[PDB]
């Protein structure tokens, strides 16, 4: 089991960390969602589906910078929605394919009432997402840590 980003940065068997750079809607109004769809940027696969089934959770999702300060968040994982920042580990998603498959994570971030102006700064860390991978074969319990950075400013009109 291993993962990679759309620009080809890989985290190998055993886990590790990688940076993910996301383009963001430049203008988001109070009452609208900023959507960070990581399923287009983060992909994983099973290296031995002939024999092994891999299990994948969102162990934890943390908010930083302007997302922490200025937004109210929800994370959708494989069709279900949870608070973001997270309060518990999600159920498992099964990976039984050697072909790259999206990590089905998306953030829905809506500005808090006090938000206004530059709510997210280009280059800033906005989230850390922890992918936890186990299997039905041995005792592997690996973390794939995804550091999410904004590619651009996000302005909340006032
Ligand atoms: C003849 C025995 C060959 C054993 C190969 C084990 C490969 O393990 C890796 O791939 C696994 C499947 O995705 C998940 C693991 O957790 C490792 O990621």
From Swiss-Prot:
GO BP: any one term: cell adhesion
Single GO cellular component term: pilus tip
Keyword terms, alphabetized: Fimbrium, Signal
Role description: Involved in regulation of length and mediation of adhesion of type 1 fimbriae (but not necessary for the production of fimbriae). Adhesin responsible for the binding to D-mannose. It is laterally positioned at intervals in the structure of the type 1 fimbriae. In order to integrate FimH in the fimbriae FimF and FimG are needed.
Gene responsible for this protein: fimH
Primary location class: other
Location(s), subcellular: Fimbrium
Listed name of the protein: Type 1 fimbrin D-mannose specific adhesin
């Amino acid at each position: 089991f291993a993962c990679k980003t759309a620009n080809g940065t890989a985290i190998p068997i055993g886990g590790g960390s990688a940076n993910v750079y996301v383009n963001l809607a430049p203008v988001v109004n109070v009452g609208q969602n900023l959507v960070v769809d990581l399923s287009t940027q983060i992909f994983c696969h099973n290296d031995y589906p002939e024999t092994i089934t891999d299990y994948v959770t969102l162990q934890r999702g943390s908010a930083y910078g302007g997302v922490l300060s200025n937004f109210s968040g929800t994370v959708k994982y494989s069709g279900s929605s949870y608070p973001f920042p997270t309060t518990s580990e999600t159920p498992r998603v099964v990976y039984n394919s050697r072909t790259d498959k999206p990590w089905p994570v998306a953030l829905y971030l809506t500005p808090v009432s006090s938000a206004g102006g530059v709510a997210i700064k280009a280059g800033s860390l906005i989230a850390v997402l922890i992918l936890r991978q186990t299997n039905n074969y041995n005792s592997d319990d690996f973390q794939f840590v995804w550091n999410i950075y904004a590619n651009n400013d996000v302005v909340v009109p006032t």
